[PDB]
Design a protein around this ligand. Structure first.
Ligand code: MYA
Ligand code: 31A
Length: 411
């Protein structure tokens, strides 16, 4: 059923995954010495290319490939339009490996045809808490705890094959070449997400959306006017009333994050993330990179209420091309990122996220039900969407867990 994925070190069925109790590798160990030096074979009219993601014209090439060929919804109404500044941010975190940015281009004219990117991440991915409880009942705590140390692994994103080269088995070649380059750096696990079902997720979370500009969202068919709003004399007026927000944040001491906040944000964030079964571990430099504000890309606010920072939230921006509607060019979406609340209820913290996003002209706020995102869905008028983000590991056996046990935000 899966001519490529049946050859890979991933659990092959939900039934296999349901049987996994402890975290650990799928493969017996390999060595860097075992891995081919030479890039994976490709047709001789193509070549491998490692873009320099600190070079504006190489970023622009990838930007255009993804603008025209990256993820669409199933109804080909919207297509992500990640910006050039977003790609630089996403692809170049501290200690990133340039060789893990993998492209295919035509040899003759250097046209970019396909892309996949890996970045390093330090992830806790040991056996989940409940399975450790049972393991300790049975005298198996040691085996269950064996892989508890945060691991330096690869996070994969931005897999894209030009629309004219689809269904030619080029994505398996991309994946094999990325695997080779990662393996050559002595890393043997990856984490990735997808909206499609592949063998085999360890978690799956529904999408959620919070309308900020419902008139536009209805016009572009992101949203509809539900049937119950039809029993109003003015359905759209009542939809705008449902979703209206303050212009000014409510929390005293809210302000944008600055570099001197990095140590305190790291502390409260890590204290929080550490309570989840799967979660990243961030250095000061990584907190700085992934959370300090960057115009048009990432937006991060702290609560510093006559006291050291006690709370913070972040969101990032991905516009989507409105490919199915001529009246608008872009859908300006905010995505809930990391946050931590120690002094105020989480719903009060995230209400200010929505207030700030609306004031900055975002049309919708999106998230997946990871972290404690379910805890403010109803009060803040998030609605469940039509899809799921599935979380996967490469070469890591892992029990099925709930999405509320996942603390890794993907970009
Ligand atoms: C240790 C280090 C390891 C590093 C690697 C870790 C693994 C990383 C894995 C990648 C994580 C990516 C995370 C993200 O970026 S998810 C975002 C993926 N990108 C898009 O959706 C953008 C638009 N679509 C395209 O560009 C193409 O349709 C793609 C490139 C998706 C497939 O190209 P194409 O449509 O021309 O098909 P093919 O004939 O070449 O290939 C068909 C095979 O590809 C399998 N397929 C289809 N969709 C996906 C998918 N999203 N992840 C993994 N595999 C996928 C499919 O089941 C089939 O295999 P099998 O069913 O026959 O077995
Ligand atoms: C808004 O316009 C578009 C354009 C293309 C596809 C889709 C469907 C979708 N794949 N949504 C998410 O992945 C997603 C949903 C909710 C929260 C976060 C989401 O995605 C993130 C960014 C993509 N990488 C994973 C996180 C929507």
């Amino acid at each position: 059923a899966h001519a490529f994925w049946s050859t890979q070190p991933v659990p092959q069925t939900e039934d296999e995954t349901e049987k996994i109790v402890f975290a650990g590798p799928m493969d017996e160990p390999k060595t860097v010495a075992d891995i081919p030096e030479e890039p994976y074979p490709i047709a001789s009219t193509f070549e491998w290319w490692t873009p320099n993601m600190e070079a504006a014209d190489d970023i622009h090439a990838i930007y255009e490939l993804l603008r025209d060929n990256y993820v669409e919804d199933d109804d080909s109404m919207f297509r992500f339009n990640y910006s050039e500044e977003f790609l630089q941010w996403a692809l170049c975190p501290p200690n990133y490996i340039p060789d893990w940015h993998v492209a295919v281009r035509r040899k003759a004219d250097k046209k970019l045809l396909a892309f996949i990117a890996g970045v390093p991440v330090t992830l806790r991915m040991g056996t989940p808490k409940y399975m450790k409880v049972k393991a300790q009942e049975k005298g198996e705590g040691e085996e269950a705890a064996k892989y508890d140390e945060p691991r330096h692994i690869c996070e994969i994103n931005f897999l894209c094959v030009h629309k004219q080269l689809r269904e030619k088995r080029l994505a398996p070649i991309l994946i094999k070449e990325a695997t080779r380059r990662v393996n050559r750096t002595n890393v043997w696990q990856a984490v990735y997400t997808a909206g499609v079902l592949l063998p085999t997720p360890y978690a799956s979370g529904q999408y959620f959306h919070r309308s900020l500009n419902p008139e536009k969202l209805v016009e572009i068919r992101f949203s509809g006017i539900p049937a119950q709003y039809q029993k109003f004399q003015n359905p759209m007026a009542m939809l705008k009333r449902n979703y209206q927000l303050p212009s000014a944040p409510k929390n005293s001491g809210l302000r944008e994050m600055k570099p001197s906040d990095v140590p305190q944000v790291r502390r409260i964030l890590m204290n929080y993330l550490d309570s989840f079964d799967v979660g990243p571990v961030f250095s000061d430099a990584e907190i700085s990179h992934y959370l300090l504000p960057r115009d048009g890309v990432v937006f991060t606010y702290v609560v510093e209420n006559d006291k050291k920072v006690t709370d913070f939230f972040s969101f990032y921006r991905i516009p989507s091309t409105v490919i199915g509607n001529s009246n608008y060019n872009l859908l300006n979406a905010a995505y809930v990122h990391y946050y931590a609340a120690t002094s105020i209820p989480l719903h009060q913290l995230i209400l200010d996220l929505l207030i700030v996003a609306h004031s900055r002209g975002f049309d919708v706020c999106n998230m997946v039900e990871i972290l404690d995102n379910r805890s403010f869905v109803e009060q803040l008028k998030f609605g469940a969407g039509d899809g799921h983000l599935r979380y996967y590991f490469y070469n890591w056996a892992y029990p099925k867990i709930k999405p509320s046990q996942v603390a890794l935000v993907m970009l």
